[PDB]
Amino acid sequence: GGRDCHPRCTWTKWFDVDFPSPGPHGGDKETYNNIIRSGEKICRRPEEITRLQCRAKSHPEVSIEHLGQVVQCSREEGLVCRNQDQQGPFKMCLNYEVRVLCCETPKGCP
Ligand SMILES: [Ca+2]
Ligand SMILES: [Cl-]
């Protein structure tokens, strides 16, 4: 047809709505649920979450694996880190942040 129909995609800002506290039930839960309930906007209504990125807030360039940290960065949910999953004897998550790629397909497009 006469239109470029590939999705238009825009990254959100980075969100950091939770901060870890110590103990076996602490962690850092940067889920879309928590982000929205913190007053933050993620995507607009027409757009769909297409990609998630995750990083340590105060160590933004490093692979999280090199910190020995056990985290999940899932497109459906956001980032979850649980203190109980980390190595001891001080079992604790670092502070993470996330950002989202929001994509919207133009009108009348397969
Ligand atoms: Ca956080
Ligand atoms: Cl870094």
UniProtKB/Swiss-Prot annotation:
Q: What is known of its domains?
A: The cysteine residues in the Cys-rich subdomain repeats are not involved in disulfide bonding.
Q: What is the annotated role of this protein in its UniProt record? A: Gel-forming glycoprotein of gastric and respiratory tract epithelia that protects the mucosa from infection and chemical damage by binding to inhaled microorganisms and particles that are subsequently removed by the mucociliary system. Interacts with H.pylori in the gastric epithelium, Barrett's esophagus as well as in gastric metaplasia of the duodenum (GMD).
Q: How does it assemble?
A: Homomultimer; disulfide-linked. The N- and C-terminus mediate their assembly into higher order structures to form filaments. The CTCK domains of two polypeptides associate in the endoplasmic reticulum to generate intermolecularly disulfide-bonded dimers. These dimers progress to the Golgi apparatus, which is a more acidic environment than the endoplasmic reticulum. Under acidic conditions, the N-termini form non-covalent intermolecular interactions that juxtapose assemblies from different CTCK-linked dimers to produce long, disulfide-linked polymers that remain highly compact until secretion.
Post-translational modifications reported in the UniProt record: C-, O- and N-glycosylated. O-glycosylated on the second and last Thr of the Thr-/Ser-rich tandem repeats TTPSPVPTTSTTSA. One form of glycosylation is also known as Lewis B (LeB) blood group antigen, a tetrasaccharide consisting of N-acetylglucosamine having a fucosyl residue attached. It has a role as an epitope and antigen and functions as a receptor for H.pylori binding and facilitates infection. C-mannosylation in the Cys-rich subdomains may be required for proper folding of these regions and for export from the endoplasmic reticulum during biosynthesis.
The highest taxon in the source lineage is Eukaryota
Q: Where in the cell is it found?
A: Secreted
**The Cys-rich subdomain repeat ranges on this chain:** 5-110
Tissue specificity here reads: Highly expressed in surface mucosal cells of respiratory tract and stomach epithelia. Overexpressed in a number of carcinomas. Also expressed in Barrett's esophagus epithelium and in the proximal duodenum.
Q: What induces it?
A: By IL4.
Entire-sequence positions represented here = 3518 to 3625 of 5654
Q: What is this protein called?
A: Mucin-5AC
Which residues are sugar-modified?
A: W11
